[PDB]
Amino acid sequence: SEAVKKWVNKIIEENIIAVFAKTECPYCIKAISILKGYNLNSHMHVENIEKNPDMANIQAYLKELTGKSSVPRIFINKDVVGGCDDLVKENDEGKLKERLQKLGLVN
Ligand SMILES: [Mn+2]
Ligand SMILES: [Mn+2]
Ligand SMILES: [Mn+2]
Ligand SMILES: [Mn+2]
């Protein structure tokens, strides 16, 4: 579905930080909390793709874009971060802060 890809794309392209999640998902919650800890709320969108009639289509497209169909799936300025484990690696190693600095999102 062109429609599903266009919908996913609009989420990624109109929000600097885009997180695809599902219901009662501990690593989604952890990833979102880490990002909100950088005070990124105003430029974040979280989409619950389980509460969606086209979840499988969305997951397959996210896999085409990122290599995995699992949630959370995290994009920053359209760049693929990946999942929560990828976010933790970037956070601990300074890469996340560098990304956000280059976007003007953290001083
Ligand atoms: Mn349950
Ligand atoms: Mn804060
Ligand atoms: Mn939003
Ligand atoms: Mn939404």
Domains of the chain: 7-103 (3.40.30.10)
Measured from the alpha carbon of residue 20, the closest ligand is: 4
Tell me the DSSP string of the chain: -HHHHHHHHHHHHH-SEEEEE-TT-HHHHHHHHHHHTTT-GGGEEEEESSSSTTHHHHHHHHHHHHS---S-EEEETTEEEESHHHHHHHHHTTHHHHHHHHTTS--
4: its two tokens: 């599903």
Q: Which of 75, 97, 64 is nearest to 13 (CA)?
A: 75
**Residues at the annotated binding site for Zn(2+)?**
24, 45, 47, 50
How far is Cα 84 from Cα 72, in angstroms, rounded to an integer? 6
Torsion angle of C-alpha atoms 15, 35, 78, 62, degrees rounded to 10: -100
**What length is written for the chain?**
107
How far is Cα 100 from Cα 49, in angstroms, rounded to an integer? 25
Give the distance (Å) from ligand 1 centre to CA of residue 24: 6
Answer for the pair 37, 100: CB distance below 8 angstroms, yes or no: no
